[PDB]
Amino acid sequence: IVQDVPNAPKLTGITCQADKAEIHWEQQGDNRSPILHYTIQFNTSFTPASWDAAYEKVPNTDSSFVVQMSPWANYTFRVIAFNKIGASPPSAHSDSCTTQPDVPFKNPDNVVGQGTEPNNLVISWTPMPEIEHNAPNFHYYVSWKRDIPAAAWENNNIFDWRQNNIVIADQPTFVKYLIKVVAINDRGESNVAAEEVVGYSGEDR
Ligand SMILES: *[C@@H]1O[C@H](CO)[C@@H](O[C@@H]2O[C@H](CO)[C@@H](O)[C@H](O)[C@H]2NC(C)=O)[C@H](O)[C@H]1NC(C)=O
Numbered sequence: 001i002v003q004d005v006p007n008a009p010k011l012t013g014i015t016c017q018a019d020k021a022e023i024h025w026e027q028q029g030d031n032r033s034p035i036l037h038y039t040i041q042f043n044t045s046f047t048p049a050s051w052d053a054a055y056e057k058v059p060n061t062d063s064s065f066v067v068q069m070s071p072w073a074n075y076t077f078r079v080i081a082f083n084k085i086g087a088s089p090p091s092a093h094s095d096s097c098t099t100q101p102d103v104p105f106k107n108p109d110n111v112v113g114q115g116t117e118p119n120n121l122v123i124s125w126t127p128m129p130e131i132e133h134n135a136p137n138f139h140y141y142v143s144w145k146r147d148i149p150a151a152a153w154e155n156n157n158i159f160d161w162r163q164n165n166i167v168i169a170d171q172p173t174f175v176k177y178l179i180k181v182v183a184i185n186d187r188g189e190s191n192v193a194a195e196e197v198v199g200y201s202g203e204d205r
């Protein structure tokens with residue numbers, strides 16, 4: 001038998017719920033090599049040119065699948081069929097689903113407090129991409145204080161979601177600080193308590 005990758009599946013419909021979508025499709029021929037699994041890909045209005053995997057290796061017996069959707073986003077999906085020869089061209093993309101705003105569901109990862117020079121303290125974190133913003137006017141709220149009884153938190157709003165640090169200067173060398181980096185948007189601060197990270201001014205811990 002002469003084999004080839006499968007034909008593009010036909011996306012037949014979609015159901016858009018508040019926090020999930022059910023995508024439906026019909027395979028269109030396996031060109032003589034049984035379909036092994038499907039991949040459901042998705043793109044958003046934030047990064048429309050990027051197609052990322054919503055789910056890989058979806059069973060060959062499924063003709064529909066439920067995928068989770070994050071708050072404040074528009075999503076369109078497409079399906080690719082795979083057989084031993086390889087991947088089929090993608091199906092046409094689905095109609096879009098729009099999700100409503102909510103508070104952020106996480107705070108930034110990799111929070112570090114460390115000086116780069118003797119008398120400063122640099123607080124850094126990994127920026128959260130737009131799909132994690134969850135509502136308009138997303139910003140980071142950075143707080144810090146010396147680990148001294150009665151010391152008050154000093155705070156700073158960072159409205160640039162791509163910014164990954166703040167530099168605090170005129171600090172004593174090698175002293176301890178308690179630090180927090182919280183995600184906040186129009187709906188409120190995130191629903192997960194941020195970890196109080198221990199940091200040190202100067203270059204040593
Ligand atoms: C996901 O990517 C597709 C393109 O691969 C987007 O579809 C294009 O959208 C523009 C309008 O923004 C149309 O003018 C083009 O004709 C589109 N056509 C398709 C046929 O490719 C789609 O809008 C993107 N999804 C989201 C949510 O941005």
Ligand SMILES: *[C@@H]1O[C@H](CO)[C@@H](O)[C@H](O)[C@H]1NC(C)=O
Pocket residue numbers: 045046072073074098
């Ligand atoms: C969704 O698409 C509409 C229409 O293009 C746009 O006005 C809106 O900004 C988009 N929303 C998000 C969260 O990307």
Ligand code: NA
Pocket residue numbers: 070071072073130131132133134135
């Ligand atoms: Na989101």
